[PDB]
Amino acid sequence: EVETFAFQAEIAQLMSLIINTFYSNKEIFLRELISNSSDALDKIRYESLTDPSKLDSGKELHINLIPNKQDRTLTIVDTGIGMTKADLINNLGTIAKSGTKAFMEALQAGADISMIGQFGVGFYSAYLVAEKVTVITKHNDDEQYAWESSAGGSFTVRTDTGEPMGRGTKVILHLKEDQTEYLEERRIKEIVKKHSQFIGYPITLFVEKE
Ligand SMILES: CNc1ncnc2[nH]cnc12
Numbered sequence: 142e143v144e145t146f147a148f149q150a151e152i153a154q155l156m157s158l159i160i161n162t163f164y165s166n167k168e169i170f171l172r173e174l175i176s177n178s179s180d181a182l183d184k185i186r187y188e189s190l191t192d193p194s195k196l197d198s199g200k201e202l203h204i205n206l207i208p209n210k211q212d213r214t215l216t217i218v219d220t221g222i223g224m225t226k227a228d229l230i231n232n233l234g235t236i237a238k239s240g241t242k243a244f245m246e247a248l249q250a251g252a253d254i255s256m257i258g259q260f261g262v263g264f265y266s267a268y269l270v271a272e273k274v275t276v277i278t279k280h281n282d283d284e285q286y287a288w289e290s291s292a293g294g295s296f297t298v299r300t301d302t303g304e305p306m307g308r309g310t311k312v313i314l315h316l317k318e319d320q321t322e323y324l325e326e327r328r329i330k331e332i333v334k335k336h337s338q339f340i341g342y343p344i345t346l347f348v349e350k351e
Pocket of ligand 1: 177178181219224233309310312
């Protein structure tokens, strides 16, 4: 059972702008997604301070980066608070409609695309490098779901049959054919050290057999 939804018009326009604008500094996508994971780990931590049973689904708090050259995917995994089905449908827990309107107003007044995170919609910078994004997520108060979109104005939500993750979110980037540099260990390391060196959770870069 798969359900299909239309993006609100402002989010559809934001995604088409990210996909079709000439902008060379694409590497900022990974900074924005690591920051999103850190915010979600802060949230489950705060809830656990008064109710430790919230970590019955997993006590480790971390971020993993997993490249796969055979599938041409780069995946970002966190053990944060996760998303309910309502959260996924509601623009992955963001205020994306008003955030877009601010981002547009800022771009006209001189800002550039790398400031996207200051408006609450940094998740959509994934489309600088991906042609499709799949999101797997599990919140303590709901079941495991998969969200997916290739842009084009719609997304799908379904109940996920894959491996149970316990609690958290997985962002799988199906990369554009000319953006494979972001599967290389040296390149990922460079980007993390430049943009994310003070994140307060351990970041582990997996390697491959090759
Ligand atoms: C983008 N929305 C998110 N909500 C909850 N956990 C996450 N981890 C990465 N992105 C998120």
